[PDB]
Amino acid sequence: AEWFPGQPRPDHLDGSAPADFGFDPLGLGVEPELLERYKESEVYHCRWAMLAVPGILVPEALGLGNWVKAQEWAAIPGGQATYLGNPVPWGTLPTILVIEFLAIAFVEHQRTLEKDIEKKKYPGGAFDPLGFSKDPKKFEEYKVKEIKNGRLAMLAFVGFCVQQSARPGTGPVENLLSHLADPWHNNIGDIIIPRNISP
């Protein structure tokens, strides 16, 4: 389909790619190589954003804290972490920083020795143990579903960040419950119009 009904689609976007709805007003993907890089970047971003949403929502829904509150055990000299209400014996900032740096630097490396363009985004193999990708038609439709769900997760991350900035000290689940309490008074309106009656 098309993102803007009644608008001609750009020449460099012909709809053959998964989830291609002809959205590129600024013309960032005119160069084919840049478009190919952007595709893999978008899929990699979508997967991280999709992983983030349950990890932001579930701990707060269980009362374990808040996606912003959970990061403030650091910035305290004696700070120790907590998992499901249980202290982490090694959960101190200098240790976790080194472990995170080493592990992520090692796994992001050797993601880069993959030179086949199609397998930079869809490696398969050990990452596809159940074999969903063997059927080509199903593989293509699953690609479309992955990109479409990822875009929604990306938008939800911005929702989380802007809600946190707009209402400090609150969480996404708290915001949803507050809206569901009085939907006609707890909205975005008192934030874009910040309680300032001009007359």
């Binding site: 305290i76 000299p77 200098p94 080194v98 080493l102 630097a105 020795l113």
Partner: protein, 98 residues
């Protein structure tokens, strides 16, 4: 209370491991494309005899070509990190954010 020898040795070891097994390929493929040159030719080819590269110094019997210059660079990075850790842990700085 932090042992200086342990911290320095561990940081140097980690830096050398990263430089030898993780970031080696990127560094080599980047130095391959950046050779200083003036007017389309290298400094030595221009006539600067003091700009000749030391072939007898950069060669090594490492299976991937790790040499003394890589050791010096990654060890300097490891020592810098180690001394940052020691100097940042000894002080009692508390950013009172919360």
């Amino acid at each position: 209370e932090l042992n200086p020898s342990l911290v320095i040795s561990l940081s140097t070891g980690v830096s050398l491991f990263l430089g030898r097994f993780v970031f080696f390929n990127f560094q080599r493929e980047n130095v391959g494309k950046q050779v200083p040159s003036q007017n389309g030719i290298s400094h030595f080819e221009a006539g600067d005899e003091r700009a000749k590269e030391y072939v007898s110094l950069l060669k090594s019997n490492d299976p991937v070509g790790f040499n003394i210059v890589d050791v010096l660079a990654w060890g300097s990075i490891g020592h810098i990190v180690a001394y940052y850790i020691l100097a940042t842990s000894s002080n009692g700085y508390d950013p009172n954010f919360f």
